[PDB]
Amino acid sequence: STGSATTTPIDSLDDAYITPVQIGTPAQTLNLDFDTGSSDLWVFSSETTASEVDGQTIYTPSKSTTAKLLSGATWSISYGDGSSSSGDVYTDTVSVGGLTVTGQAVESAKKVSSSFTEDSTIDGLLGLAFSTLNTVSPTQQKTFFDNAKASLDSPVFTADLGYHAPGTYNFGFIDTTAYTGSITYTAVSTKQGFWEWTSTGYAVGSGTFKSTSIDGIADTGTTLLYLPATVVSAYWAQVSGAKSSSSVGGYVFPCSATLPSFTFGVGSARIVIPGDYIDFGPISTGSSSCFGGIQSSAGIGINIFGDVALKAAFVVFNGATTPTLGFASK
Numbered sequence: 001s002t003g004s005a006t007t008t009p010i011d012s013l014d015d016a017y018i019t020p021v022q023i024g025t026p027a028q029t030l031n032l033d034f035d036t037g038s039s040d041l042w043v044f045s046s047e048t049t050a051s052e053v054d055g056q057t058i059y060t061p062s063k064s065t066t067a068k069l070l071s072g073a074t075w076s077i078s079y080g081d082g083s084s085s086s087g088d089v090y091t092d093t094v095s096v097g098g099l100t101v102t103g104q105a106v107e108s109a110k111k112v113s114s115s116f117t118e119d120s121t122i123d124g125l126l127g128l129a130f131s132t133l134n135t136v137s138p139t140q141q142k143t144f145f146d147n148a149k150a151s152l153d154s155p156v157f158t159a160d161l162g163y164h165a166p167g168t169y170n171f172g173f174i175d176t177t178a179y180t181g182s183i184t185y186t187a188v189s190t191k192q193g194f195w196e197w198t199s200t201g202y203a204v205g206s207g208t209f210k211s212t213s214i215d216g217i218a219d220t221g222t223t224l225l226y227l228p229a230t231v232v233s234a235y236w237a238q239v240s241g242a243k244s245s246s247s248v249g250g251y252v253f254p255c256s257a258t259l260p261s262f263t264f265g266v267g268s269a270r271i272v273i274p275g276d277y278i279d280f281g282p283i284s285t286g287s288s289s290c291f292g293g294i295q296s297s298a299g300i301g302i303n304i305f306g307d308v309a310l311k312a313a314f315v316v317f318n319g320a321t322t323p324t325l326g327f328a329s330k
């Protein structure tokens with residue numbers, strides 16, 4: 001089998017992407033944030049504290065004839081931005097883009113933190129990291145991809161995120177029309193539960209490529225590109241007036257600037273992030289100071305190839321017995 005679904009930016013800055021997912025019988029369609037940096041499929045629901053729901057579409061398990069409460073199971077997660085959510089668990093039928101999994105753990109939120117409530121466009125998360133990170137207790141549950149994998153034509157999924165435009169998540173096949181050149185594959189470590197790999201270096205604009213190993217994670221659920229302070233300083237030094245602002249929480253730059261591109265290495269291959277991808281707009285409405293899309297990883301503790309980087313590529317998440325990651329230009 002295969003599946004194919006369109007993924008859409010939630011706003012004009014590509015702060016995150018949502019993909020429609022069918023849950024239950026009859027189907028209840030919720031727009032989920034597909035997240036290769038976590039491993040829980042959780043949803044706003046009829047169980048979510050009413051004051052914590054503000055415009056999201058909810059899953060109502062009592063209206064699904066295929067829903068079953070997973071007895072005794074609870075979940076609780078927190079994310080890199082300090083947000084969190086928790087609740088109980090059902091199993092139900094879940095379909096993405098025509099690919100169906102029966103008996104998928106659907107984690108129903110009883111509580112969500114303010115950042116989730118405040119974002120009416122995201123109805124929950126669909127985790128696509130390794131199932132060793134799943135938070136369900138006392139019996140850890142499998143991701144949608146792990147449950148689907150054996151049925152798929154090939155044990156892979158691909159992320160093709162758009163810049164200010166729709167894109168695609170495919171399951172079970174590689175669309176050879178969706179990228180240019182070849183796909184370069186690189187090794188993955190699953191020891192931290194992430195799609196963790198080592199970039200071979202970087203360049204800033206038309207500058208020379210610096211060969212240096214950068215270990216980090218391919219995380220579709222992180223918006224920005226988080227890299228070592230040395231690399232980030234070298235990038236922003238090429239932007240007149242850019243500075244690291246402790247009050248704002250990172251590098252900012254004049255909104256009037258034209259940003260240089262940023263290149264990262266995948267083996268001997270190179271992925272070029274155009275400068276415009278690195279502009280996250282005014283820090284506050286009407287300001288002429290703009291937030292940068294490349295930020296230091298010193299605070300978060302891991303380098304993160306988030307959407308800023310991934311949307312410049314066609315990315316293969318290869319779930320073969322030994323997982324690997326593939327990157328192509330597009």
Ligand SMILES: NC1=N/C(=N\Nc2ccccc2)c2ccccc21
Nearest residue numbers: 035037038079080081219221222300
């Ligand atoms: N996969 C995720 N990464 C998130 N934040 N990452 C981050 C990195 C550095 C600084 C701040 C946040 C996040 C937030 C909500 C749901 C999923 C995720």
